[PDB]
Design a protein around this ligand. Structure first.
Ligand SMILES: OC[C@H]1O[C@@H](O)[C@H](O)[C@@H]1O
Ligand SMILES: OC[C@H]1O[C@@H](O)[C@H](O)[C@@H]1O
Lengths: 276, 274
């Protein structure tokens, strides 16, 4: 068998872990794994181009896709379905029901978790002003993290959501956005950033602004730099997924589809706070 | 005795806040003194009203400040005299006051952006205009920031105009007339309060541009409602000014009698139609 893996891009180190897990499973199975992603996360047009190119020029036995857009990728996936090529979605949900399954974090639950963690960092005897650094509307994973977070906090006594701008897919964009927020906002008491790039961008902005360790800060995903910032007390906690295990299971599920075996509609790959 | 100082009388909106405050005051059997400037945005005039009442007299002040920063010294003077201050409608900078009763204006701006997006053909690039009110007026600054925060990075959306109109509907009319003449294409518009919405509406009609683009307005009056039902305005984001005035008085009475209040009481916001 041959499996085509198309992730969101290369703008997060996260994706290398998903790929490494997928490659481990493909190696164990004795199957060929192709990996083709856009340079940048969020490049919807580029991802659609990769899918159509491989459908025409070198079609796989199954497609494993992390869609950059929950809606804008459905026509691409429907083309695979009409060619009877199974599609397994990884990491971030796809709209509709053209695909055969999902293997991902429960991203809505991860956001609720992040809000609970933030509440635990705050002095809840006073009103607290909260900022959310959103990623990009239509990116299902972060849209769900953002909504789960807001659903815990919106009516919470002593909590005010004072900022929720979109940062975009780039850590440079997240840095620019956070720098503006820090300058323009009177008091930020708590922050949540829903992925690797937004967490790293915000961190760099917080340091450059002389604001380290000043407020509660829940981030998402982990790298050596984020782990260090957390151990230093610059980040209050990180909500972390299991990207290697997710990549590994996505390959196993895709192979089940190739062999005509049933798979769960949703395989939840787990989420946790990195520290107590 | 409760002193109620709103922004001015440039918007029919303030009569609804006053009516709610008066209902609450009547129900509680307390005297309400409503004292506002003639025009919204008259910062110096509002400071004068506050200075006068400190010099000769109330048990609490309910204030809708014309400037989030410029009213802070006036409010601090009340705090130094231990007269509770409840801020209504539009936030005040600092922490000299005892609470806020208002729409969540930032969230209301985000709502307006989402409503505007729903009016647009998002298969194609769309040009968007925003009519700002006045820097330093917290309520509209927050609506504008919420709206922009949703849209500034949105695929296929370009913000091509964001001028300030000022507090008068006549000024909003002049500004919109200029935009309609000078801009090659406007695909969507947001106006963040009653005066800006009415001024834009009148300009759009006078330009022969009615029903040509998506238009989210803010606040409601019989005239704005008619325009919406006619399809001239796509939707209105509306506050609950009567409930806001009523709650502001009840919160002020709680302050007078020493019952703790929340720092922010969110009085709600919705789209007027589906
Ligand atoms: O979109 C940003 C990507 O970064 C990783 O957190 C996520 O799983 C997500 O899909
Ligand atoms: O400042 C303009 C005033 O008009 C009403 O929309 C508002 O609540 C606002 O404070």
């Amino acid at each position: 068998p041959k499996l085509l893996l198309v992730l969101k891009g290369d703008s997060n180190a996260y994706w290398r872990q998903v790929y490494l897990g997928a490659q481990k499973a493909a190696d164990e199975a004795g199957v060929t794994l192709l990996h083709r992603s856009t340079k940048d996360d969020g490049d919807i047009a580029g991802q659609i181009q990769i899918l159509s190119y491989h459908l025409s020029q070198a079609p796989p036995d199954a497609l494993i896709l992390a869609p950059n857009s929950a809606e804008d990728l459905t026509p691409s996936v429907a083309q695979y379905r009409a060619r009877n090529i199974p599609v397994l979605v990884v990491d971030s949900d796809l709209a509709g029901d053209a695909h055969q399954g999902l293997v991902a974090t429960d991203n809505y639950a991860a956001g609720q978790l992040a809000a609970r963690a933030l509440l635990a960092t705050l002095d809840l005897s006073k009103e607290r002003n909260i900022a959310l650094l959103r990623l990009r509307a239509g990116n299902a994973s972060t849209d769900q993290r953002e909504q789960g977070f807001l659903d815990v906090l919106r009516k919470h006594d002593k909590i005010r959501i004072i900022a929720a701008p979109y940062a975009g897919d780039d850590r440079g964009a997240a840095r620019s956005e956070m720098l503006r927020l820090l300058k323009e906002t009177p008091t930020i008491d708590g922050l949540f950033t829903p992925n690797e790039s937004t967490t790293i961008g915000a961190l760099v902005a917080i340091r450059q602004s002389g604001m380290s360790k000043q407020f509660g800060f829940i981030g998402f995903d982990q790298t050596e730099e984020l782990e260090a910032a957390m151990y230093a007390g610059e980040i209050s906690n990180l909500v972390v997924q299991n990207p290697e295990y997710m990549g590994y299971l996505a390959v196993q599920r895709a192979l089940d589809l190739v062999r005509g075996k049933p798979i769960p509609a949703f395989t939840d790959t787990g989420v946790r706070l990195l520290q107590e």
